[PDB]
Amino acid sequence: SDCYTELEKAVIVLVENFYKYVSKYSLVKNKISKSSFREMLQKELNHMLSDTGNRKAADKLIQNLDANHDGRISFDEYWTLIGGITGPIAKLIHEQEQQSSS
Amino acid sequence: SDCYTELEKAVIVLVENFYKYVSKYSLVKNKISKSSFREMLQKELNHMLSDTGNRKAADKLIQNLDANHDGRISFDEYWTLIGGITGPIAKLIHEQEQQSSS
């Protein structure tokens, strides 16, 4: 009796927040523009973004990925883009759930 | 009135599921063993792991990271390790919460 850990439902929810944008197998034959990652990020990850710098740290990754990428999408592509925003604010996140020791 | 998106609380929860293992700033002077990632993964991400192959897809990353890494932990280290397990099962996740079209 197992509850499904928050982390684990969350790895499910992150996998859906990406796979919603393809038809199940379709990583080349039906796919988004990589230019929607940086835009969908301003809808589904909106509460840490306002400074706009956190979004500039998405758009830097787009161009870095374009240089290497025909649009054979990889599952690893989206995951390695999220880690380029989740970084400068990453300390600040852990410190917001505390807020009592700067 | 904003609710805090599941994805976004979940990026918080992932950031906590890592930073709980350092004293806030301490990434070199107080830090975990990289051998704890592959082990803690068998506790907090337990419901997709049983096959044990998904865990061998963690331990493969550890050895790849050791060759490059004194233990100056980055925030990006943990995040790029989670993507090495979240991959072969990644399609299977998106297919499980649907289950109605193989």
Whether chain B has a CB inside 8 Å of the CB on A92: the answer is no
Q: Is the distance from CB of A86 to CB of A79 less than 8 angstroms?
A: no
Is A16 annotated in a binding site? The answer is: no
CA A7 from chain centre, in angstroms, equals 15
- List the single best residue of A9, A47, A100 to mutate versus B (max B Cβ within 10 A): A47
To which residue do tokens 């925030």 refer?
B75
Q: Is B79 exposed, middle or buried (0-12, 13-18, 19+ CB in 10 A)?
A: buried
Q: Which letter does DSSP use for residue A34 in this model?
A: G
Residue of A nearest to B96 (CA): A12
The rounded distance, in Å, linking the Cα atoms of B73 and B27 is 5
The domains of chain B, with CATH numbers, are 1-102 (1.10.238.10)
Distance from CA of B85 to the nearest CA of A (A): 10
Reduce the DSSP state of residue B7 to 3 states and report it. helix
Q: Is the distance from CB of B6 to CB of A48 less than 8 angstroms?
A: no
Rounded (10°) angle between helices A6-19 and B6-19: 130
The rounded distance, in Å, linking the Cα atoms of B78 and B85 is 12
Q: Residue A7's closest CA among B19, B30, B27?
A: B19
The rounded distance, in Å, linking the Cα atoms of A26 and A29 is 5
The rounded distance, in Å, linking the Cα atoms of A81 and B10 is 16
Instruction: Give the contacts of A67 (CB within 8 A, at least 6 positions apart).
Output: none
